[PDB]
Nucleic acid binder design. Structure first.
Ligand SMILES: [Mg+2]
Ligand SMILES: [Zn+2]
Ligand SMILES: [Zn+2]
Lengths: 49, 48, 49, 102, 515, 48, 151
RNA sequence: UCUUUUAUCGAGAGGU
DNA sequence: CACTCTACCGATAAGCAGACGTACCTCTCGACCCTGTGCTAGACACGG
DNA sequence: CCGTGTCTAGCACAGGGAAATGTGTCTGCTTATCGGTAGAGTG
């Protein structure tokens, strides 16, 4: 997997059709995913674990 | 009576929760997984 | 890949992505069937054709 | 437990040695025998245990031909047959042996 | 001593010269012997055990139990300490090798002085008994119904005996007659081992109080209560056809299942021993005392007809004063009773075989001690609390694994209680925090998700009672002047104070303050 | 906390019934909003 | 002749009763003890006989005149099912209940299958039988190690 | 020139 | 030409039984019983 | 008195086969009661 591939991106449980979106890949070190914070509204997500 | 027993086997070969008569147990005392149950349910075939 | 994510990928409309997710990337299989009776009871042999 | 081949009664084997058969011993004399004799006239192998409480009015007893005998446990089927020498001796006594082995 | 002896018997007719010999085989059981835990090596040697090696080698930690036996022979023509199994031992209780010693040796024995004990050890593991919970028994509760039902008010009671602290029977009384619906406003009860809702006048007169002044004398406590008296009329108009005792006795005897053909002669005796035993067993089971039960039923019907006409609120089912916790005592007892019955009956059967060949049963070989050991070790080992062959339909999740992680998530585990109401039916009445939970349980600490409000954690200054006998209290009472029951008369005792003791109603007094 | 523990699963099952009820209604090439076999639900989608 | 002993309407009835499997002989025994113990008393057990056929697992048959006597015979018997399951036998079915018996096979030179031991399941030829008539000498393909791992 | 194994049923404790 | 007296289909409840409990993910702890038959070992008796 | 053989008892392994009685809402479908006639045997 390399830079600029389009991957599907999902959180459970998905409700409205905005909880499954395709992002562009960007390789980074360490062990966690990364999100721009502006996409925390359709996912109903927060970084508290 | 034995023929009725054969009817009972053919019955519990496709249904275990036959309302009306006790569940045919395993050797170790647990209810047998009749075919009717591999399918229905959240964890069967058509959901799982 | 729960039923709800299936509902979402129906909401987007990507039918090819679904046909993929539920075939190649899981469990594909092939069956030789007849055309008169219509059952999966065909006795087949390939290297003898 | 053994079953008398002549009358079909079921008793502990030692009884056949101690007291003889209570129905038959007037002719069989098992009381005064050796174990080989007792074992030739009584069988360790039998089937169909019958409690006969009222010999003389039981139809079951009449069918099994134990209606003239004493109340007790009897066997429907007794395996083996009396030795020919004992059958011959019983016949000398006016007793007719009808085998109970089927 | 719940079942003191065993008795066989042998009548006669044993291939002899008409000589009876009535032979009974009786076995008696006196004295217990408990020894400290001991390891029996595979080599054959035995030596003392301490919990450290009990944990290391994946072992159990139990004590042998010795029980004495004795036999006797009845006739009429016309041995010693038997090892009955092992019992797991709780750490730091008197019967342990750690209640003494003190520090320096506790350090030599590889044990921390900050561990507080309270957990079992099975198969090299640490088990804990979740304080279980049940409802209180031997009181009187009056609940109501919803409205698409022909029943408006119900009085209920579970009856349980004291030596043993175990439940027996369930008895009810139902008030029909919906508010101006259902035609008759009659009262019908329910008994153990019956089929139909038997009326109430029939059980009064069935106990031996055939007139009406005695009945309306027992039920109501005033001669001005013409409202309750106004509701009573259909009960006597319903119980008119029966006028004496025997026809009501057999009126009940015919319904009580039994066989089918125990006519008047034997069936009356059937209904009689039914109305001595099952009905209200926590009161007594000896004859010549049915007056007592009649007084009690009078109080019960009185309370029902005080709740129906709306003079006192319906009972709340969650008032914390009406609940009892079952800790490590009232649990281990029941299982051991069951297993002990099983052992007794196996000894019975082996005795039957070894006596048919006319021999002596050695007692040393007539006991298979693996019953109690395997039963206890199984029930504490898995958690399905009950037996093995009855896997389902038996309670699960009572013995859990200790939660060794931090030092708070352990004290917060040896103090936990669990209510088995379920997970279905949603409802927000057994899950809320009741007003009577002030200082008896914690308000904040509780899990989340499915079991919010169910799992509880006791407060920091709480305590569980043990169980004292009541006869001393009875003496201290009958000193000062508790008037017995039979001298009672409600027109004579319209201002008395009614003294209850453990629920059963034993006497009345007059001036309560000095008492 | 109790009410929060109660209602969410209720709403989830309700949504499963809704979605399993409405999942074959398409917009064919001329404005009709037919189901799986032609029962014109709406003659013109959204009325406009 | 046996044909003169057939049952008639004047003979007692026979009821069958369901009992715990393997406990049929015990129940027959227990009935006899009860009968003999009550003979001549004011409450005799009014049964004539009782029996149990091996071919008929889980049943005892009891001969009497009244059904109540059947209930009396079984009262308190721990091997009997409490459900009111007794059934009536027809007179025309009586003698068949008491049929004493032709497998009795086995001939030298024939094949049999062994049922026990290391040769369990193996085919063997019958070579000969003991004089008394109990054990048979069998010719068997051996399963040997020639002492290879013996100590 | 590859390849290369994770039982089963059930129970409980948890995280969003 | 009033009369009942019964064979109809309504419309009742009426009782009944069963069918049904969010989504995904992590972790730890357990296993058939009883009876009968055969083989081996120990003890007792008999013979040398 | 000692040794050998036979018999009995106990233990282990393998094969075959079950039971003493002891949570709550809804809808539809399968059974009794009710009427109601709606006729015909009747005076
Ligand atoms: Mg979160
Ligand atoms: Zn074809
Ligand atoms: Zn004889």
């Amino acid at each position: 997997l390399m830079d600029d591939d389009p991957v599907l991106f999902n959180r459970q449980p998905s409700l409205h059709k905005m909880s499954m979106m395709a992002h562009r890949v960007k390789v980074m070190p360490y062990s966690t995913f990364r999100l721009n914070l502006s996409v925390t509204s359709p996912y109903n997500a927060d970084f508290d674990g | 009576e034995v023929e009725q027993l054969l009817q009972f086997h053919v019955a519990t070969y496709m249904d275990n929760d036959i309302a009306g008569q006790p569940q045919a147990l395993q050797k170790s005392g647990r209810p047998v997984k009749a075919i009717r149950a591999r399918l229905k349910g959240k964890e069967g075939r058509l959901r799982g | 890949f729960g039923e709800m994510e299936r509902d979402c990928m129906i909401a987007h409309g990507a039918a090819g992505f679904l046909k993929e997710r539920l075939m190649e990337a899981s469990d594909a299989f092939r069956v030789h069937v007849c055309g008169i009776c219509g059952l999966m009871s065909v006795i087949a042999n390939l290297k003898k054709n | 437990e053994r079953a008398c081949m002549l009358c079909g009664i079921v008793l502990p084997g030692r009884v056949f040695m101690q007291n003889g058969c209570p129905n038959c011993d007037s002719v069989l004399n098992l009381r005064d025998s050796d174990q080989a004799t007792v074992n030739e006239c009584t069988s360790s192998s039998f089937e169909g245990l019958v409690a006969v409480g009222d010999n003389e009015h039981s139809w079951v007893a009449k069918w099994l031909r134990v209606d003239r005998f004493q109340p007790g446990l009897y066997a429907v089927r007794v395996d083996g047959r009396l030795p020919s020498d004992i059958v011959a001796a019983l016949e000398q006594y006016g007793v007719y042996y009808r085998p109970r082995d089927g | 001593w719940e079942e003191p002896r065993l008795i066989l018997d042998q009548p006669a007719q044993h291939t002899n010269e008409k000589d009876n010999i009535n032979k009974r085989y009786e076995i008696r059981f006196g004295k217990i012997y408990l020894s400290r835990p001991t390891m029996t090596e595979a080599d054959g040697t035995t030596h003392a055990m301490f919990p450290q090696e009990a944990r290391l080698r994946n072992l159990t930690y139990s004590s042998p139990v010795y029980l004495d036996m004795e036999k006797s022979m009845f006739t009429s023509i016309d041995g010693n300490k038997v090892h009955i199994g092992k019992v797991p031992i709780m750490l730091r209780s008197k019967f342990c090798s750690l209640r003494t010693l003190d520090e320096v040796d506790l350090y030599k024995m590889k044990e921390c002085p900050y561990d507080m004990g309270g957990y079992f050890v099975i198969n090299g593991s640490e088990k804990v008994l979740i304080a279980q919970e049940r409802s209180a028994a031997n009181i009187v509760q009056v609940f109501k119904k919803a409205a698409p039902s022909p029943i408006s008010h119900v009085a209920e009671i579970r009856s349980a005996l004291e030596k043993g602290s175990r439940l027996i029977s369930t008895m009810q009384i139902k008030l029909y007659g919906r508010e101006d619906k259902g035609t008759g406003r009659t009262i019908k009860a329910t008994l153990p081992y019956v089929k139909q809702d038997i009326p109430i006048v029939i059980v009064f007169r069935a106990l031996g109080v055939v007139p009406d002044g005695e009945i309306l004398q027992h039920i109501c406590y005033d001669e001005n209560d013409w409202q309750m008296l106004e509701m009573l009329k259909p009960c006597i108009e319903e119980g008119f056809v029966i006028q004496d005792k025997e026809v009501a006795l057999d009126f009940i005897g015919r319904r009580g299942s039994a066989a089918l053909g125990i006519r008047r002669e034997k069936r009356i005796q059937y209904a009689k021993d039914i109305l001595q035993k099952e009905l209200l067993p926590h009161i007594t089971q000896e004859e010549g005392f049915e007056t007592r039960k009649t007084f009690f039923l009078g109080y019960m019907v009185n309370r029902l007809l005080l709740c129906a006409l709306e003079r006192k609120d319906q009972d709340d089912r969650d008032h914390f004063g009406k609940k009892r916790l079952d800790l490590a005592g009232p649990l281990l007892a029941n299982l051991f009773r069951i297993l002990f019955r099983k052992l007794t009956r196996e000894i019975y059967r082996y005795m039957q075989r070894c006596i048919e060949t006319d021999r002596d049963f050695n007692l040393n070989l007539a006991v298979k001690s693996t019953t109690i050991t395997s039963g206890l070790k199984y029930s504490l080992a898995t958690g399905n609390w009950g037996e093995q062959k009855k896997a389902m339909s038996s309670r699960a999740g009572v013995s859990q694994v200790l939660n060794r992680y931090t030092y708070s998530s352990t004290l917060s585990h040896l103090r936990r209680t669990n209510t088995p109401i379920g997970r279905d039916g949603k409802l927000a009445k057994p899950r809320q925090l009741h007003n009577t939970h002030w200082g008896l349980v914690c308000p904040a600490e509780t899990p989340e998700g499915q079991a919010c409000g169910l799992v509880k954690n006791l407060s920091l200054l709480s305590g569980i009672s043990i169980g004292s006998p009541s006869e001393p209290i009875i003496n201290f009472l009958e000193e000062w002047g508790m008037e017995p029951l039979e001298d009672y008369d409600p027109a004579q005792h319209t201002k008395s104070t009614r003294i209850f003791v453990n629920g059963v109603w034993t006497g009345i007094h007059r001036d309560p303050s000095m008492l | 906390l109790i009410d929060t523990a109660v209602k969410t699963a209720e709403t989830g099952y309700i949504q499963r019934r809704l979605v399993k009820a409405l999942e074959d209604i398409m917009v064919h090439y001329d404005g009709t909003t037919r189901n799986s076999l032609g029962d014109i639900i709406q003659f013109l989608y959204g009325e406009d | 002749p046996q044909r003169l002993l057939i049952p008639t309407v004047d003979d007692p009835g026979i009821w069958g009763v369901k009992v715990r499997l393997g406990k049929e002989k015990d129940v027959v025994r227990q009935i006899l003890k009860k009968k003999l113990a009550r003979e001549g008393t004011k409450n005799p057990l009014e049964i004539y006989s009782a029996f149990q056929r091996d071919s008929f697992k889980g049943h005892v048959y009891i001969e009497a005149r009244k059904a109540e006597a059947i209930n009396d015979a079984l009262k308190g018997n721990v091997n009997v099912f409490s459900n009111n399951s007794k059934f009536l036998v027809g007179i025309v079915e009586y003698k068949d209940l008491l049929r004493p018996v032709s497998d009795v096979k086995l001939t030298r030179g024939s094949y049999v299958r062994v049922k026990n031991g290391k040769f369990k399941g193996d085919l063997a030829q019958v070579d000969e039988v003991l004089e008394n008539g109990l054990e048979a000498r069998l010719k068997l393909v051996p399963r040997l190690d020639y002492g290879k791992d013996l100590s």
